[PDB]
Design a protein around this ligand. Sequence first.
Ligand SMILES: Cn1ccc(-c2ccc(Cl)c(CNc3nc4[nH]c(Cc5ccccc5)cc(=O)n4n3)c2)n1
Ligand SMILES: [Zn+2]
Length: 349
Amino acid sequence: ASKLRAVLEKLKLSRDDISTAAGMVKGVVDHLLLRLKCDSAFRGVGLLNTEHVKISAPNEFDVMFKLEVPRIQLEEYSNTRAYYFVKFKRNPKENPLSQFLEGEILSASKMLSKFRKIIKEEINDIKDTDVIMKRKRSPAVTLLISEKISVDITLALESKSSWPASTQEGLRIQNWLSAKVRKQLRLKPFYLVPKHAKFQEETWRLSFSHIEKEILNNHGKSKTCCENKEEKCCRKDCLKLMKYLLEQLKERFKDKKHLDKFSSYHVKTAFFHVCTQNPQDSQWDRKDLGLCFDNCVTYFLQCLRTEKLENYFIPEFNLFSSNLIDKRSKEFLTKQIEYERNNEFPVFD
Ligand SMILES: Cn1ccc(-c2ccc(Cl)c(CNc3nc4[nH]c(Cc5ccccc5)cc(=O)n4n3)c2)n1
Ligand SMILES: [Zn+2]
């Protein structure tokens, strides 16, 4: 309760502390977009959220470029619910992405190659800052700025049509944020990013990287949640502590492999499931931070032990299935978390 608050305070002070890092990243990114926009395949390219995956690493940034693709035809791959072939409707007004077609199918490989190549050409043009490009270890392109700051650049396709049918029963926020809000969010665009399941096929994965911010900024059942003193909730703090718990555990055991397949979006997913289960703001009273954090831990442990964690958008996709993460890894993380809970969370210090 008091220990958790102190953890949150030290995290806050490093975030809010004076840093030239964001200015250096923006300068590099703005150069790239100008270079990409001159190219025929990428003239519509722009920034998605005009981010930090690790709270413990303030020099590591995550950036997403988006490209609008109108009249897109999506074909689900092998019933995976999340992976799709990208085809183009027969509306030929010269498609800018034709050079990436392999048949009727849009090739992620060929598109990333030319994105990669154009970026590489603008890197070796900038003289002010030293920018170093790493070699395709997806997640698309990783840059190194002044040997301290690192940026992962992801290329996403953007569609403004209705979300695919696999999402129909997801985003189960009706009893928490309202049916009206669920409708508003589902009018936003959706995104597609490269990579396949399990030979390599040219499939894209659905991406909803823009939804979390929308929820977190308007997260209460009450419209006035966290706008006054009588309605302060701990939802954002609990999510931060879950993300930091996993980070610290991945760092403690980084020389082993048992935690390599877990990442923040697993924690995000399980957190927002607890928000669905506990929709009222009184279930998230600031005074109950330690107890609320415990709900979240307990639910995440239940997910590990049962090997069931539904994607928040595509509920039939089990993030914790045997084919994606094996029993041994889930059993290892369970033991570490259970040890943390029973020892007043050592990792935080
Ligand atoms: C990064 N990765 C690697 C593989 C996948 C992935 C796997 C299966 C599916 Cl079925 C999908 C479907 N798409 C998808 N699912 C999420 N879940 C959240 C987390 C979240 C939860 C609740 C509210 C807000 C955010 C973030 C995000 O961007 N997405 N995108 C994505 N993702
Ligand atoms: Zn609140």
